[PDB]
Subunit: 267 residues, 6 copies
């Protein structure tokens, strides 16, 4: 096979088009149920809140997994992390209602303390096998200069957990209690410097910002003086790539390209 | 020293040529004994099987270290990981016989569970100090989008273990039982986006694919319909860089450049 | 806000100039007290010794944190790591005296064994909250091909510990014993491939080299035959970027850009 | 309450009889489903195989959890751990069929490597919440001079996991996927120096020994020359306490006595 | 020395009386400031609430360290651990006010997740060196059948941390920031099966029980129907050893006897 | 087998005399090479220095394994742990010379930081398999009130490592580099409350105390005012059990009794 192509460029295009059937025309078109994985309460709204409302409005069931409890998100010396986590849970329930999301799984690892371990893969794999989502969204763990370990670990653990949910010897007691292996159809990484699919969110921008500001403990007015400019600059970064005012960017690749593929950066 | 050069380009070339005596003409020419480090059974054959056969055919002694047992490599709900691991040991013995390899060290860490720790360094440094190889091959841990932790950890632990095998206070009980410090002459990284040395394997391609397919548990005919196209695409990516049909790529650098070198990407 | 810009370029420049007030003109001008974090004894003098002497000579109080004891830095089978660590403490005290540094905190983690953990963050945040430095310097953990885990871990732990030092629920017993949250004004990363600020050290080069050679155990004459060429080639790399003979490079970014910022590589 | 008793002996007897309703007349009489937790394949048969057969013969459904794979159980240099594990799985299925057991959960931690961690607790609580057993058996982790960490860790993790299975904030994703909190009705510890309940197994001793010897890889004839005398000495130790030839001993206590009870050794 | 005694009994008594100056007449008589270390909110009140009130009433400053947040203490599926932990902080402040305690350090490790590690030692040693207490109370980690890892770990970590607070190379950054080594004068273990000092609390029993029931989330009326009988049975167990109605028991030993002492059980 | 004994006492005596061939008459009589494992430098001399000199004088080759470097053993704020450790290595070489010991393996784990892990077992098993000792001595990890984690961990790791050195799948790279499995003939535990074999050291007491005081950094004259009385009180405790002035005690048991043996405290 692949004996009659003559150049690498020809093989490459034939591998993507024919063998992997990859395309970026509308990667989310067939989804019925997706899971959006966030490191902290508010990252699904920040990274992809317009696209979550577009999906919910088309009748896609969007479920969150939140990896941590947001305990550390305050500079108030009188607000304990326990009290903040309870406040953030209610904030995310109000944000998610605005975006059409009706189910959140809380892993409850402490903020700044998310482990990078098989145990946390097992939590993700248990929920993937229970819910059988078509798509999974998570942060791109290769974002340049990303300095928060919870973000880098969420992205790597989500990619690994999507792969290992298909393997019956990984977390085998799930198979023994009736949670069968599941093969997700696509992963999409948000918070990405290298998007290859952009969703125009220009007419949902105000709704997105409203869903973000529902995390009131995080976005005081003072903080918003910097964050609204930031968030509009990011959405213009994405939207300008497809000639629209505001966009949300995602990186999607064939499953093969997440492993031993030396030209994965050509898409 | 280095006071008479005038530009960074001049200093850089003098550092590589004269001080480090670095050359990519024939980096494997003097090797008598090399160790090829693979994350899982079948990675030496996939990443570099053509070059392993060339080296064996020249009378180089090629030894494998396999970091993990391949336990997780099945989607059959009836095949336990213990039985798969036993099957894969036999597959690698048959693959290795085709490529001229006569010695495999099995570290037996569980697949998907290779630790990143001093303990696993010590296992690599014990074998390096026992066998005194001239060269060590391992995956490039900086391959973009590599999402298997066993692969990233094998590359980093091999680079570190080659450096630490020279240090008598590292794993000092080896020195006390007669395994002296050893200084490897070169490292070469396979599975790389940034090769700087390519071996033409055009006339060994069918043998490389045979050696790969000897891992029958991983390469069923259905899976091969994707994997032969992929493997030929990858070998054309490398071969095209030197104007040949099929190549295997390696990244080789002076030892110095694996540490505090801000222009290491200029080779 | 940010509704009247019409291109990403416009928004980006307005976000950096107006909202973040970021400028690379003289990022160190207002500093009264800085901490320089080194993985091993000698890294502050190698990565940034000229700039340390410039800062001391302006009356800046420069403090080191050394993460590890340098135990493993010998190929002499007769010198224990314990004896080497004692030797290296004295070498660093001599080197530091040459550069105007009068205080070093020794975390005493063993060389090649620095953990990547909350416990080590807590050590950094205790010292940052006690000393209240204006600036913190550390290695850039994203230097390409950096293969020493103690270097990568120092960079990431330093950036995370600057951020978490401002959070009263992080390491809360410090607040309870009277070490209040502290907000550092800038971070600067040395050992970097992507500097955006270069200090001319041409007239302090011989003093820098003297301060490095004070670490006699590391820089024997034989080793210096390779290391003087290396260090001059690095200083030319940096100095050529601003048209001077010898430079030390730093990467400085707005705090926001260390997290979720897809265009952080544009500075 | 408890204001009218006037001696500790009076209060103790009232607390056990009235408040805790504790007795040891026939602690297993009401059981419909029990789980027997073994560190390695063959420990349920060795510690309590006669009682398992009594229970199965009364219509009790007896389920095993085996914590490890038995990988390390050979002194044959030609038998890999992987092959041993596969052999021991078949040995246990044969042993279990002799004793009436029809379901085994295999956690598959490697022998000599069982962790003592929240992750292993979560595997035990998942199975306890799925199966809702009335009783759980495990080794007594306080057996004097017990030197195998897998045995000590299995006893502690079993006791902890029975308590934590009732707590909806412990391993909360189970509650989210439909596995509700479960309250086991008794624990019984085997392999105990301090039994307080003994089962007469005099007429099932030959069956018990057959079930043990079905683990042929462990009990070669040579090893059996020591192990039959050992096993009969232990069963006489227990049976002599109740005036019978062969017994199996268990320690049962009120749940309260597993925590902050300074007279728990008085039963 | 000790050459003129003739029997072990003679030597033993002379070691305790003359060399170690040990006695148990009134071990708390000279204390001005004590720390009571509890695993969870409510353990100081349960283990030793009468004695805490006796000490405060004498003008001793009693300070708590609470190792964990009590997150897991509920069987209500509607109450999150975060909310529980906030509730229990308030409960403890009310309980402590009743007993005369005015300061509590909260380590905030999650309940059922307290580590056994150098990091937690370092938190105890920072507080011991800041507060310089004369006495420290903690659970006896050798209580038979104690099945809660947080209780066993608190007792061992407290004993260890008392010893290591005297050592300037342990947690050396405390010494560098001005927290000098401290030598506690006594440890007293509560929750013990082997008390050697009993405090009569007969006239403070109703106050102790009030301070316990202030932890309303733990002691609902239904649970109290078992817990008041238990608590009265325990206090009778201790008081009967000194011929009083209700007592609290402590185990106190010379520092030497916590290490390499084969007759430590003779006191 | 064992069908003709009628009582447990009969079976027990026959199991020990005939099947296990257990004798406490002269357990060390056949030894040619023993390893004495100490947690810190000085514990072999303190726990068993008289016996080590008896054994050396009979021509037994006594080798030490010291698990830690003694870093923490000082209350001088000017003496670093690095310097202490180097001083203590020389102290031990002088002490060991007095006792006839000519070889010490230093594992160099930091004092107070000995792990309890497979990695440290592998260090012990590599030395056991290299040296093939007839006997191994270690602390009894079940000594009551032993509060130093390095002592408890040394005892358990030594017992485990003796057992696992016989198993070719444990630390299998040893067998691959030519270190075959080894079966030690006896373990003897020192620092024990339950000795069953006592060596009379009455005429070697002053030599033992000289070998202890050779650890000058630990035994200043001030400290010795407590430690001489302690050490003579301990040797009297042991010697009185066999009617001699000064003894060293050991606990020896058949290998079988270290596992699943409910009457192991009957010897
Ligand atoms: Cl075909
Ligand atoms: Cl085809
Ligand atoms: Cl990370
Ligand atoms: Cl405004
Ligand atoms: Cl020169
Ligand atoms: Cl020269
Ligand atoms: Cl990784
Ligand atoms: Cl085909
Ligand atoms: Cl505004
Ligand atoms: Cl505004
Ligand atoms: Cl790292
Ligand atoms: Cl020269
Ligand atoms: Cl009542
Ligand atoms: Cl009542
Ligand atoms: Cl254990
Ligand atoms: Cl026979
Ligand atoms: Cl004297
Ligand atoms: Cl005297
Ligand atoms: Cl524990
Ligand atoms: Cl009532
Ligand atoms: Cl027979
Ligand atoms: Cl026989
Ligand atoms: Cl321990
Ligand atoms: Cl004197």
């Amino acid at each position: 096979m692949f004996e009659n192509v003559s150049t690498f460029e020809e093989a490459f295009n034939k591998l993507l088009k024919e063998v992997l059937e990859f395309n970026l025309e509308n990667p989310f078109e067939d989804a019925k149920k997706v899971i959006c994985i966030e490191p902290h309460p508010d990252d699904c709204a920040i990274g992809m809140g317009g696209t979550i409302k577009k999906l919910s409005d088309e009748g896609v069931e969007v479920i969150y997994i939140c990896m941590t409890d947001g305990y550390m998100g305050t500079t108030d010396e009188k607000l304990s992390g326990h009290e903040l986590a309870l406040i953030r849970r209610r904030e995310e329930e109000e944000s998610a209602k605005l975006l059409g999301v009706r189910k959140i799984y809380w892993l409850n690892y402490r903020d700044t303390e998310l482990p990078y371990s098989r145990e946390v893969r097992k939590d993700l794999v248990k929920i993937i096998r229970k819910e059988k989502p078509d798509g999974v969204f998570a942060p791109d763990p290769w974002l340049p200069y990303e300095s928060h370990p919870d973000h880098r670990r969420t992205g790597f653990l989500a990619i690994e957990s999507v792969a290992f949910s298909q393997l019956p010897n990984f977390s085998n007691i799930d198979i023994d209690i009736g949670l069968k292996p599941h093969s997700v159809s696509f992963i999409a990484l948000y918070y990405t410097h290298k998007p290859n699919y952009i969703v125009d969110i220009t007419d949902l921008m105000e709704l997105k910002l409203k869903a973000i500001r529902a995390h009131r403990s995080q976005f005081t007015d003072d903080i918003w003086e910097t964050w609204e400019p930031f968030l509009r600059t990011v959405t213009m970064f994405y939207g300008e790539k497809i000639g629209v005012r505001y966009g949300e960017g995602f990186r999607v690749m064939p499953g093969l390209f997440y492993h031993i593929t030396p030209f994965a950066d050509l898409i």
